[PDB]
Design a protein around this ligand. Structure first.
Ligand SMILES: N=C(N)c1ccc(NC(=O)Nc2ccc(Oc3ccccc3)cc2)cc1
Ligand SMILES: [Ca+2]
Length: 223
């Protein structure tokens, strides 16, 4: 996260770190056995790390559960990043509580103007690289479909929305991928792509989670 702030330990209880020997993507816990992330974060050998604040230090609230299976959305296209969503099942259910909690899926799509919370352990610099050990947070508005398409012409499909600040300075970044964009307590986006991080007129682009609720529910119902 570029231009964000330190969340505070376990203040984002649904935030997940996907680790394969190292943190490589964020994710959101949506019930005791399932995590949602970006399909572009797909990897064999995922261990889900819940209850994390400093991902490099064992602090006392973590749960480390290997993934038993991953399901990349059937229509995910890696070239356009259209339908950039994936579900991960945990081999054992997580113990839910105040510090490790699931986030609700949306009943309706969010609208332009809604302020949302985006969090992750990604890069905090637009020029340079510095990866924090603790979770960073950014409050950011959903942008209109027209400003999203003006910023990235010919690239925004109906399964994507932009969120952020067209002046730059505040954005998600590499390493934040697969992580949450929560608006009014509902998971509305997944950190997916953007040109650079925090550049002027190049906001973050996010998977539009409301389009996937029936698929998430149906998939969890049979797996
Ligand atoms: N400005 C941001 N908010 C922002 C910018 C970039 C990313 N990260 C990103 O775009 N990652 C990425 C996406 C697709 C990729 O493409 C792949 C294609 C095939 C296989 C694997 C990855 C690779 C990296 C996240 C947030
Ligand atoms: Ca830790």
């Amino acid at each position: 996260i570029v231009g964000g702030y330190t969340c505070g330990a376990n203040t984002v209880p649904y935030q997940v770190s996907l680790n394969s020997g190292y943190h490589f993507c964020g994710g959101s816990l949506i019930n005791s056995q399932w995590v949602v992330s970006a399909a572009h974060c797909y990897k064999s050998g995922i261990q889900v790390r819940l209850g994390e604040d400093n991902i490099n230090v064992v602090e006392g609230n973590e749960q480390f559960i290997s993934a038993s299976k991953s399901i990349v959305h059937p229509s995910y296209n890696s070239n356009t990043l259209n339908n950039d969503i994936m579900l991960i099942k945990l081999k054992s259910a997580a113990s839910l509580n105040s510090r490790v909690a699931s986030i609700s899926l949306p009943t309706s799509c969010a609208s332009a103007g809604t302020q949302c919370l985006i969090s992750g352990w990604g890069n905090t610099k637009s020029s340079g690289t510095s990866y924090p050990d603790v979770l960073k947070c950014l409050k950011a508005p959903i942008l209109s479909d027209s400003s999203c398409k003006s910023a990235y012409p010919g690239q925004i499909t109906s399964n994507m929305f932009c969120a952020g600040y067209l002046e730059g300075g505040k954005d998600s970044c590499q390493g934040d991928s697969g992580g949450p964009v929560v608006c009014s307590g509902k998971l509305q986006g997944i950190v997916s792509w953007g040109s650079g991080c925090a550049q002027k007129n190049k906001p973050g682009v996010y998977t539009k989670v409301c389009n996937y609720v029936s698929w998430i529910k149906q998939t969890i119902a049979s797996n």
